[PDB]
Scaffold this active site. Structure first.
Site, short mmCIF file in Angstrom:
data_model
loop_
_atom_site.label_atom_id
_atom_site.label_comp_id
_atom_site.label_asym_id
_atom_site.label_seq_id
_atom_site.Cartn_x
_atom_site.Cartn_y
_atom_site.Cartn_z
N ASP A 71 0.88 -1.21 0.00
CA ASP A 71 0.00 0.00 0.00
C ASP A 71 0.90 1.23 0.00
O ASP A 71 0.59 2.21 0.69
CB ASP A 71 -1.03 -0.07 1.13
N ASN A 128 0.90 7.19 2.81
CA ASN A 128 1.63 6.34 3.78
C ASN A 128 3.07 6.79 3.90
O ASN A 128 3.79 6.26 4.79
CB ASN A 128 1.54 4.87 3.39
N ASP A 178 3.16 3.49 7.22
CA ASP A 178 1.91 2.77 6.88
C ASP A 178 0.92 3.14 7.97
O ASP A 178 1.11 2.67 9.09
CB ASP A 178 2.12 1.26 6.81
#
Ligand SMILES: C[C@H]1C(=O)N(c2ccc(SC(F)(F)F)cc2)C(=O)N1Cc1ccnc2[nH]ccc12
Ligand code: NI
Length: 277
Positions: free
Chosen positions: A142, A147, A160
């Site tokens: 991700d 992030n 994250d």
């Protein structure tokens, strides 16, 4: 943790101030922790928490995930400072990234022409981290501007925040009613076959490049989540951002090579940039 180690710290040392937002396993706060950085009395920290509802085995999901970060040592990944295991609140301590997530920062810059240099600078810091991560068999899954985290001195680091901030709910599709998916950041192979490699990460780095150039527009805006799936999987690419430098657009295209083996390593990228400097 199972098996507390030298990382374990005392609940007393950790004072919590305000909230940052909702983590996968519970709320996340600002706070301060004593004796956690050497040669330094007090330390601004992000305190990540589990839930006074969710019992032992998802309290272990949490700690053992953070046990992975014990291995790490990149000035460009967010730093684990300690753990608090024994006791009902159950919290993890982390270096406090004081300017917040990189998507927010880029959006804070909209309402008033960011230098090739500035952007190349950030993009290099981001790849530093991801290069370390992929070195240590760690695949992020991700990577996104949301992030990446920004420090007091404007240094970018890989972190994250998780898939679960109110603020970025349009960035996740519940495909199949299975997990939340960052469909707009995902490689065609991640989209079709659920394949997540270091090169799935290099795809998402290209998207982050795109975000940096657009001061964080929604990728593939005007496409619904199902249409993005169809579009990307079927060979479809993002448009060159308005006023995007060539250096930057041409990295994005190397990152978006359909065939993952044709994309570059973060090392290749760091190399590619570090000449322009
Ligand atoms: C929710 C907490 C956290 O647990 N992580 C994190 C999770 C995993 C890794 S390891 C990896 F980068 F993925 F490889 C690193 C960081 C964060 O970034 N967080 C947010 C965070 C950390 C610091 N300052 C902040 N300011 C405002 C938010 C914020
Ligand atoms: Ni650096």
């Amino acid at each position: 943790v199972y098996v507390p180690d030298e990382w374990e710290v005392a609940r007393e040392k950790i004072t919590m101030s305000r909230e940052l937002g909702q983590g996968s396993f519970g709320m996340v706060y600002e706070g301060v922790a004593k004796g956690v950085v050497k040669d330094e009395p007090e330390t601004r920290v992000a305190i990540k928490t589990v839930n006074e509802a969710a019992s032992m085995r998802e309290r272990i999901e949490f700690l053992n995930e953070a046990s992975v970060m014990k291995e790490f040592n990149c000035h460009h990944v967010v730093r684990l400072l300690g753990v608090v295991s024994q006791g009902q609140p159950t919290l993890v301590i982390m270096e406090l990234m004081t300017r917040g997530d990189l998507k927010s920062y880029l959006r804070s810059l909209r309402p008033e022409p960011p230098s090739l240099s500035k952007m190349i600078q950030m993009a290099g810091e981001i790849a530093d981290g991801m290069a370390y991560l992929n070195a240590n068999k760690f695949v992020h899954r991700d990577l996104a501007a949301r992030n990446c985290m920004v420090a007091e001195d404007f240094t970018v680091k890989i972190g994250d925040f998780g898939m679960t901030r109110d603020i970025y709910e349009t960035d996740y599709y519940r495909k199949g009613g299975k997990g939340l998916l960052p469909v707009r950041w995902m490689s065609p192979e991640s989209l079709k076959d659920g394949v997540f490699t270091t090169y799935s990460d290099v795809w998402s780095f290209g998207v982050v490049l795109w975000e940096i150039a657009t001061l964080a527009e929604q990728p593939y805006q005007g496409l619904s989540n199902e249409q993005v799936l169809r579009f990307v999987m079927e060979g479809g690419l993002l448009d060159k951002p308005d006023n995007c430098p060539d250096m930057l657009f041409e990295l994005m295209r190397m990152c978006w090579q359909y065939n993952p083996k044709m994309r570059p390593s973060f090392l290749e990228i760091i190399s590619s940039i570090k000449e322009e400097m």
